[PDB]
Amino acid sequence: ATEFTPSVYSLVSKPLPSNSRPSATLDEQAETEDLISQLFDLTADPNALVSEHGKRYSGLRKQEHTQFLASSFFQLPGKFVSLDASRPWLVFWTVHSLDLLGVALDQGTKDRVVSTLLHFLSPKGGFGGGPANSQIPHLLPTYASVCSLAIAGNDSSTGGWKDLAAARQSIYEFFMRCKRPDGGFVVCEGGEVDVRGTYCLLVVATLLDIITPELLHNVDKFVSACQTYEGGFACASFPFPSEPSCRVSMAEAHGGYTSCSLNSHFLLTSVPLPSFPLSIDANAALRWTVLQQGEPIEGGGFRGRTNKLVDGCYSWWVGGGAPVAEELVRREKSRKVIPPIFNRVALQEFTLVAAQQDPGSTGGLRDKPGKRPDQYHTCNNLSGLSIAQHKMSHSPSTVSSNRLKFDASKGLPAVKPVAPGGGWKNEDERQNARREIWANALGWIEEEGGEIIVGGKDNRINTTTPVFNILGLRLKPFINYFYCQE
Amino acid sequence: TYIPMSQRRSWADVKPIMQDDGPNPVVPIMYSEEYKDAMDYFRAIAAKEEKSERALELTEIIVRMNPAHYTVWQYRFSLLTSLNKSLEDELRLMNEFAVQNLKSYQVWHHRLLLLDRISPQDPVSEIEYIHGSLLPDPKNYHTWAYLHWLYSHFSTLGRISEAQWGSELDWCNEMLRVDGRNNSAWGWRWYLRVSRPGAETSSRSLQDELIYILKSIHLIPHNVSAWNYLRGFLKHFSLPLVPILPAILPYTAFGFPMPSDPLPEDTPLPVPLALEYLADSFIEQNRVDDAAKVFEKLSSEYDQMRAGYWEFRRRECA
């Protein structure tokens, strides 16, 4: 399984060559190479059969990371004010990380999570970054809140899911208020337009069965035009008027926006609209993705854009986009008519050796050595570690089996579109859409025999789902609840 | 010491509203007295939808303590427009925010909304401000995105002159001279030269661009930014790879720039993306086995971090 995933310790580490042309980029790169390679030098090779003497042991310090997340989970110092508008993310980073680490919350604590998040829900639609009496709704807290309710909630009267179901029409109306004619969404009233909002909106709309044609119009075109000449995706595309005569990407290909763009596009491929979604260049996206994996001297972590530094959070943003790009490339190959596509071993080595907090301290995972761990990097390092450990693919036979078991006669009330002709043409078309969207959302599998657990089985974490980034054992009962499947 | 707002004469008529967290919230933040007080009164201000100078002052107090507070930024902009405040004065305040370290998706979007609403007939002074702001961090993503938006928005209004575009390319060229590894400035060059609707596409311009790209590769042969730009350039304009191969082959060991006869020092060969170029040029010539051979060498020897990807490209050749 490792013929094409060489360990970082098995390869010659060498600096990025200067070509005798110094620059500020190269000064930072070289300094970062020194930092990471020195930590690898102090650390026993995780693949070694007996851990070496004097060296640091790289085993995943799951209990330290649990304690890191617990201490910040029930009280945060005053400095976290800068994240006061991000508290649903603090919830999500915590409870998804605990899911990945295999640590259960008790029911009382889960109930506190649900109650906290429901106080962020506005009756007019959507979650904000804080209580509804203090913050307006925002697409990004709405994703983080919905996913956190998938992780911590349940179908009972105190489980939060019932409240989400009752909120479907208002959430939909919030989404439609966010919609721009060119296919972008503002993240909130008066807010910025980029693929983060598209991603967060499409995930929530998929999970809650509130997708309509009017919601999706031009959304595919906005995302497709975000792809740059490098093959990744920028934050947004600009529509030049003549509807628009052309669309132009507005910045660099970036791992964060490439994740959101690939995931958004992938979610759109489930939607049965004519000539929809507008295609992307999947091969160029796959090429960009694999090119962002760092060299052995930088630990095999991912960078977020060309000529910048590796960072553990891109294990999720870039690494977690790889199965999506791979599947889109597979689909185009099949339309014209298996070795791992990135170094799954090296990414785990980066996570274990470089991205963990030094042992016996606060715990947590981090951007890189020399950076303080935080909830965000803890969640995204572990999410990317999961993608590296477990070979995830989107299985057509699984989707086909899902189609066979779908019950189109069960479901929540159809959303009422804002425009008279903005819904599905008829129940045949709406039910076919519900079936395709639900069946593909549940199409990701872990490939049997594809597991690679660097450092031994005690390093294994649970399997996250590409596109959604929650465990499948959370995704399945959650989306089944809102589509009334069982 | 701090004076509570319940003790302020200007605020004596306002009953603050407490944060509605519910009984025992998770991830609670231990807010400073100043921040809690300001938010208690903002909740009251926002609930009654008061548009006033004191509400404006309160929003500034809050976004200084938390520049990421998108709700308060939204309220602040609605105050500016409701009160017909000087948006030029607000821009001057936003210059200081980024100066006093206060930055965010919200500060940058606020600046964009200001520029959109002012709608200057000539945005040159904002262009120059943005150029200056890139000195501390020349790769600041929001800033590069904002610069793209500024040129795109005001060019749709017909307000970017040919002189302005030309000075912008001059500025971009200087950025890449100071750091040819600045991928953000490479992306900007692509906008200026290729993607923007007003870009010239002629035989001259394609020749000039290819000269600039090749010169850049020969200056820094291992610069991924220059290689990706070359590959995007050729792909975008449907240009064959083979005619340029003479300038690339020395890195895989006429009339366009060639490598320096003694290659610069610290240039270990082969350059993997040069091999990628060679392999794709073999595919262009339908020499699929010669391409597979280069992919195999990238996989097994010259770019082993991507051993699996390069093996995938090798298998595709069959």
């Binding site: 991000s86 980073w93 970054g129 990004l140 983060r196 965000y376 | 998108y70």
Partner: peptide, 4 residues
């Protein structure tokens, strides 16, 4: 942790 600035993603929004």
């Amino acid at each position: 942790m600035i993603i929004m």
